[PDB]
Structure formats: structure tokens, C-alpha cells
């Protein structure tokens, strides 16, 4: 019964700890090792964000939502990507119709991005 609890919701994107930053997509499957072990990560470059999460053994790659000024995955959006975690994380919600991977676990990486 020894691990620290989730939290950081209301933080700063910057002090996150499954903020991992720039990654490449192999890197992913070196972090996680958990079925429901997620990070988020930059693309090559680009000012858009993937969601690397292990499920089935896969480490999948969904961009982080986008809109308006939100990030939306299921229902709703939120007006950060940390606080539209939580209310994944805790309900279990599916990132997909297509692939039904649920928020569980955070490769911490620290607050220092990059």
C-alpha cells in the first residue's frame, strides 16, 4: 500500500509530472510499463500535444484534443489538459470509441520541462 496519490488538477500544465515534454514515440514504451501508464508528450516540433498510454500491451498515441481553447475527449471540454485528466482519471471515461482506453496511471517525469 505504498505509492503517493494522483492530484496536481489544479496546477500549471509546467508543474505536472506526466508532462514529460518533447519524446519521441519509442521512448513511450520505455516509460510506461502498466497497462493504464500514461504521459503526455510534444510532436516533432509542431505546438500539439499525443497522449502516450499503455493498454493491451500497445503503448497508443491519441493527439491531445483541441477545439476552441479546451481539450475534449469524451464529453465535455476543460479549459486546461490537466484538469480534463482528473475528470478522466477518476471516472474511468473512455479516451476513444475506438480503442476504450481508460486514464489509471502517471509516469512521473518531475515539474523541470525541458
Same mark, same amino acid.
Given at each position: 500500500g505504498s505509492s503517493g496519490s494522483s492530484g496536481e488538477? %489544479?496546477?500549471?500544465? *509546467?508543474? %505536472?509530472?506526466?508532462? *514529460?515534454?518533447?519524446?519521441?514515440?519509442?521512448?513511450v514504451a520505455e516509460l510506461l510499463v502498466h497497462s493504464g501508464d500514461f504521459l503526455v508528450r510534444e510532436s516533432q516540433g509542431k505546438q500539439e500535444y499525443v497522449l502516450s498510454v499503455l493498454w493491451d500491451g500497445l503503448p497508443r498515441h491519441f493527439i491531445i484534443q483541441s477545439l476552441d481553447n479546451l481539450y475534449r475527449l469524451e464529453g465535455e471540454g476543460f479549459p486546461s489538459i490537466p484538469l480534463l485528466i482528473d475528470h478522466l482519471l477518476s471516472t474511468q471515461?473512455?479516451?476513444t470509441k475506438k480503442s476504450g482506453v481508460v486514464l489509471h496511471r502517471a509516469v512521473p517525469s518531475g515539474p523541470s520541462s525541458g
Open positions: 488538477v %489544479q496546477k500549471p500544465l *509546467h508543474e %505536472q509530472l506526466w508532462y *514529460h515534454g518533447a519524446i519521441p514515440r519509442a521512448e471515461q473512455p479516451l
